[PDB]
Amino acid sequence: PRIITKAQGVHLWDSEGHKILDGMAGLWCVAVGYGREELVQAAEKQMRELPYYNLFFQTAHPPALELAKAITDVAPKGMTHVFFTGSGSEGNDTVLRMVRHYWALKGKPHKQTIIGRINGYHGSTPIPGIVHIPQPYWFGEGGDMTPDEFGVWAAEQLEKKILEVGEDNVAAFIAEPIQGAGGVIIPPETYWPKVKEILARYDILFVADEVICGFGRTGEWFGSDYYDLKPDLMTIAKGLTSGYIPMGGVIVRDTVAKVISEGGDFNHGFTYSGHPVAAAVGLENLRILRDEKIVEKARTEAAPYLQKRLRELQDHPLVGEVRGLGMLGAIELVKDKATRSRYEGKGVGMICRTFCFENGLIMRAVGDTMIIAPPLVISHAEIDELVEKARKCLDLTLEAIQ
Amino acid sequence: PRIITKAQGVHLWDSEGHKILDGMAGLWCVAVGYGREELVQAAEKQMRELPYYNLFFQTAHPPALELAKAITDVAPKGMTHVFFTGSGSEGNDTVLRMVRHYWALKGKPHKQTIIGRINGYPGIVHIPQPYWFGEGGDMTPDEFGVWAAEQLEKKILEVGEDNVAAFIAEPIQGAGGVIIPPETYWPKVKEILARYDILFVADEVICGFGRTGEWFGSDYYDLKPDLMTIAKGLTSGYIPMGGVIVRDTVAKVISEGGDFNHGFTYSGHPVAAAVGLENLRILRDEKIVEKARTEAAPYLQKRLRELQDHPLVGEVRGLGMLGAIELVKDKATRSRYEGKGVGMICRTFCFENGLIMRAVGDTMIIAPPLVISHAEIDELVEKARKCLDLTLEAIQ
């Protein structure tokens, strides 16, 4: 039984004193790495000054506002409003309400169906008003097409579905820039360009799920920045606080915010914001990401090296592919690299995960896809640690297959 | 907006150094009062040791478990499962999923309609609230209660048992002005629920963790709920967290029998749990809940009721650490100062005189920290009177 005693930077240590590199940044979230005392201190300060309560009585510099202001500053242009939640998934629920409630107020209440992709639908409990298009997963679902052309097809499928459902019954299309959860499904070059093209010609809202891509994970602040999308709403969480304290929220384009306020501010609960203690943490977490240039350094210094290094693993017999951008990476485990076939039923990723655990690496396995989203602050040294331990474990996995 | 610099016990101080008594315990939540360093220290400790989960490994004593264990210990008997959320309202959403998903797995997917009450929450239907003071006209409290309870049975039949998933109610409606039910209500509702195959959800977001004097409102009115939404006083509002407590029989049906929506991550944020656990440790181990029941509550209630003499007060009501004051133009008919917005004025004068009572229309309400002292109750009822006198004066 293996118990963690201490955590620092990108590393955990067990009771035995064995060092572990957390390649998944806690669970997608721990951006600035473990043990940043500044965040602890933010929380502490607020918790004793005034833990809860806003409006009528409030602190000298309410963290709710200053955090929102901070978020809108790093957001895509046009995104001026932030409605905070206690979690990321609460964010996605909230956005579903907001898009439907939005269209109602425009006097088009028929607009209700949400178009998701396969393997990124979310909760929402087939519901006679959430439909799916195929995911842009070339490696698994693109057979023998070129990435580029597969992308275009998977993008066109959106247009088809909008028409099939009918524009006047569609409320919104909603997608993670990169699905990352379903195994870092990085789209072909051509996808988002084409989806942009489509969205431009239909009167539907566009929700970027930045729960995972948010706050530096792509190298840019948001995946929406990276793929250059113009979303109407953005769900955030996780890296908002580097996972040091629960918080989520929705960033909202001005034009949309104005509609859920004017007309009817009943459901616009004059942004009671979120919890002061969470916000205080979030604000310091954002201050740190911008002011110590961690996002910038991820883009310019960590990312390029991580990607290069990770790709060296392509030589390994077991690896059908390495893919990744920013601080996202994935490794496909195949029986034959040519046909991209898997070790059917053997559950190989499981084995590879096992060996990662045993050898002081945290990669997550999504089926036969190993994935990584390490803290944005990982060093060259630590990337060397990572790709090294990765290889050890790939060798062990292969060995174990015989 | 007045600028608070520090908070202690049941008191805030502004920049001017003026002392303010928070009669609403933050917003229903701050149970143990402000500035308990123990809670700050719990959060701090966890935030640096291990702020969030990872796929593989965990700390020596994960606070998620220890908190759930702690909750199940204070819960009504049978309540063995806790699914945590990031908020209270996320709890109520979650429970809506759970009750519907529950019935589906029993092979009765038509069971979906939720029966709420008016002023607390086809899809979702409502019955009338047990608010004798406003909506009972000239009936006796007892008989009005029975009627308001019978209205449930009527609605179940109207909707039809095979389409009803659940009935869902706060034991006492906090939000909507401390709507304390007649004696007879909950007894009768129990009677009704006993004869229909529907689930019963207690919304303990507000009544939870001592507010009634017992741990839960469900304890107090002696209800046998199938699910309980919690939040707020779980951490004394020091850090956001919520959850659902779930009867064994229900939990067994949503886990095995229909392996689906209990993996995932409902395990709850370690940092929040650490706080929650210490908050609960404090409530049980320093006997705050017990002392609320036995020492604080009786005195608060007594004292508060002295205000009944005031011209403006149609009624004082309250149990445990809940209280309400009705502001009327004529005590006989229970009429209000229609349209004058009197509660507004009374609230205003409370703010200006270092008291936080919340106004729900013309109902002033209080839910002070469970730790309020006799001294502080004296402070409260005293400032209350001052402000009632000021409000009345201002009406001329």
Author numbering:
A (entry chain B): 34 to 158, 176 to 452
B (entry chain A): 34 to 154, 179 to 453
The authors write:
Omega transaminases (ω-TAs) can mediate the chiral amination of several unnatural substrates without the requirement of an α-COOH group and are highly relevant in the production of several pharmaceutical intermediates of commercial interest. In this work, we successfully overexpressed and characterized the two recombinant transaminases TA_2799 and TA_5182 from P. putida KT2440 and solved their crystal structures. The overall structural fold of the TA_5182 and TA_2799 enzymes is similar to that observed for other class III fold type I TAs with two α/β domains. There are two highly flexible loops present in the structures of TA_2799 and TA_5182 that mediate the entry and exit of the cofactor and the substrate/byproduct into the active site of the enzyme, leading to significant conformational changes in the enzyme structure.
We determined the structure of TA_5182 in both relaxed (open) and closed states, mimicking the cofactor-free and the cofactor-bound form of the enzyme, respectively. The open state of TA_5182 is not easily observed. It shows a distinct conformation in the overall ternary structure of the enzyme, which allows the cofactor molecule and the substrates to enter the enzyme’s active site via movement of the flexible loops. In the crystal structure of the open state of TA_5182, these residues could not be built due to poor electron density in this region and hence were excluded from the final refined model. In the crystal structure of the open state of TA_5182, the “lid” loop could not be visualized due to the inherent flexibility of this region. In our crystal structure of the apo state of TA_5182, the electron density of the roof loop is visible. Comparing the open state of TA_5182 with the deposited structures in PDB resulted in an average RMSD of 2.0 Å, which is expected as the conformation of this state is significantly different than the PLP-bound state of the enzyme. The major conformational differences can be found in the roof loop and the outer loop in the open state of TA_5182. In the apo-open state, the F321 in TA_5182 is initially positioned near the surface of the enzyme, widening the substrate entry channel of the enzyme. Y322 is initially in a hydrogen bond with T127.
